[PDB]
Amino acid sequence: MGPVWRKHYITYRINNYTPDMNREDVDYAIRKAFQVWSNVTPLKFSKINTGMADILVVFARGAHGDDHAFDGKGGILAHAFGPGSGIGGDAHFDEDEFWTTHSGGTNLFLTAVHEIGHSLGLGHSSDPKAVMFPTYKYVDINTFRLSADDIRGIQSLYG
Ligand SMILES: O=C(Cn1cccc(O)c1=O)NCCc1ccc(-c2ccccc2)cc1
Numbered sequence: 001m002g003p004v005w006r007k008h009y010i011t012y013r014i015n016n017y018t019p020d021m022n023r024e025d026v027d028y029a030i031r032k033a034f035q036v037w038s039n040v041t042p043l044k045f046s047k048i049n050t051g052m053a054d055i056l057v058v059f060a061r062g063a064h065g066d067d068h069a070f071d072g073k074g075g076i077l078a079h080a081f082g083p084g085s086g087i088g089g090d091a092h093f094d095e096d097e098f099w100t101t102h103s104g105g106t107n108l109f110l111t112a113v114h115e116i117g118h119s120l121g122l123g124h125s126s127d128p129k130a131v132m133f134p135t136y137k138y139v140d141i142n143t144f145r146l147s148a149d150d151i152r153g154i155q156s157l158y159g
C-alpha cells in the first residue's frame, strides 16, 4: 500500500478562500467532504483555524510552489498529496476553475471528496461510479454516495 496517516485523528485548515463562492459555502463543502469519508472509516477530522494542520486546503493557480503547476481553466481541476509531513496530505484546487455549490462550473464538494480521497492515501479507481474515478461528472449532491469500490479502498487503509 501507499502511505497512510499513522493516527485516526486528522486536522485540516483552509489556507485561503476562492472568491468564486461565499466563505460559509466553502467551509460547508469542505466539512461535508471530510464527513463523507468519516462516515465509512474510523477517521475523525478536526478543523483548525490557526496553526499546524495535517491537511492544508489551498486555492492557487498556475505554478504554486510544488512540482505540479495547474493548467488554467479546465483540464486539471485539483490534486492532493498523500499522507506525510509538510505538503503531505494537502489538497490544492485550481482557482482558474469556477467553484460552485451546484451543477454550474465545478462543484467544490464533489471535487473535495475526490481530493480528500488522495489526502487519505487513495489512488484512482477503474470503476466509473467511484468518486476516485479520475474524471469529474456532476452528480446530484443530495443523492451522492461513495461507491462500494471507494468504501473497499478507504477501509483497506484504515480500520
Ligand atoms: O482534475 C480532474 C478531472 N479532469 C477533468 C477534465 C480534464 C482533466 O484533464 C481532468 O483531469 N480530476 C480530479 C478531480 C476530480 C475527479 C473526480 C471527481 C468526481 C466527481 C463526482 C463523482 C465522482 C468523481 C471529482 C473531481
Ligand SMILES: [Ca+2]
Pocket: 070, 071, 072, 073, 074, 075, 076, 077, 078, 094, 096, 097
Ligand atoms: Ca485547470
Ligand SMILES: [Ca+2]
Pocket: 053, 054, 055, 056, 084, 085, 086, 087, 088, 089, 090
Ligand atoms: Ca500537510
Ligand SMILES: [Ca+2]
Pocket: 018, 020, 094, 095, 096, 097, 098, 099
Ligand atoms: Ca476561480
Ligand SMILES: [Zn+2]
Pocket: 064, 066, 068, 079, 092
Ligand atoms: Zn499543488
Ligand SMILES: [Zn+2]
Pocket: 079, 114, 118, 124, 134
Ligand atoms: Zn485524482
